Amino acid sequence: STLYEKLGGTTAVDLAVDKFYERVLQDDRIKHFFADVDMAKQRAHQKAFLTYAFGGTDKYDGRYMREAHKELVENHGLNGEHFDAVAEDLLATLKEMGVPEDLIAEVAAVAGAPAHKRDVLNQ
Numbered sequence: 465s466t467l468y469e470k471l472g473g474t475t476a477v478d479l480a481v482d483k484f485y486e487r488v489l490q491d492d493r494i495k496h497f498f499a500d501v502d503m504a505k506q507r508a509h510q511k512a513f514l515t516y517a518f519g520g521t522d523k524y525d526g527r528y529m530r531e532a533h534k535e536l537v538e539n540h541g542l543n544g545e546h547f548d549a550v551a552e553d554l555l556a557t558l559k560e561m562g563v564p565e566d567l568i569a570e571v572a573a574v575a576g577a578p579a580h581k582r583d584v585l586n587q
C-alpha cells in the first residue's frame with residue numbers, strides 16, 4: 465500500500481491540505497509568502513503534488529519545485545527557517561488529524577529530503 469493509501473487516500477490528503485493552509489496562514493513566520501497567492505489554486509496544486517509525492521500518482525501535473533519557489537528565494541528572502549516552519553506545520557496538521565507516528569515519520573522524510581529542500585530553496 466502506498467503512503468497515500470495508508471494516510472487515507474483522496475479525502476485524507478484533501479483535509480490535510482485544507483488544514484495545513486489554515487495553519488500556514490496563521491503562522492507569522494511564513495504567512496506573508498502567500499499574500500499574493502491564489503489559495504484555491506494553491507490548495508489544488510498541493511493536493512495534486514502530495515498525491516504524487518505520497519505515491520498516489522506517477523507524475524505531478526504542475527511546476528517543478530525549483531521554478532515554483534524561485535521568485536520567493538530571489539525577491540522575498542525564502543530560507544531554511546521558512547522551510548522548517550512549512551515542514552513543521554505540515555507534520556503538526558497530520559498529528560492533529562490522528563495520523564500514526566510511523567506515517568508522520570514517512571511524511572517527515574519526504575518533506576525534509578535534500579532533493580526537495582535544495583530545489584525549493586534554489587540552493
Ligand code: HEM
Nearest residue numbers: 494497498501509510513526527532546547550575580584
Ligand atoms: C516542501 C515541503 C514544499 C512543497 C512540497 C511545496 C509545494 C508547492 C506546490 C505544489 C506549489 C505549486 C506549484 C505549481 O505551481 O504547480 C508551491 C508553490 C508555492 N509555495 Fe511551496 N512547497 C514547499 C515548500 C515551500 C516553502 C518552504 C514555502 C514558504 C514558506 C512555500 C511557499 C509557496 C508559495 C508562496 C507558492 C506559490 C508561488 C507563487 O506562484 O506565487 N513552499 N509549493
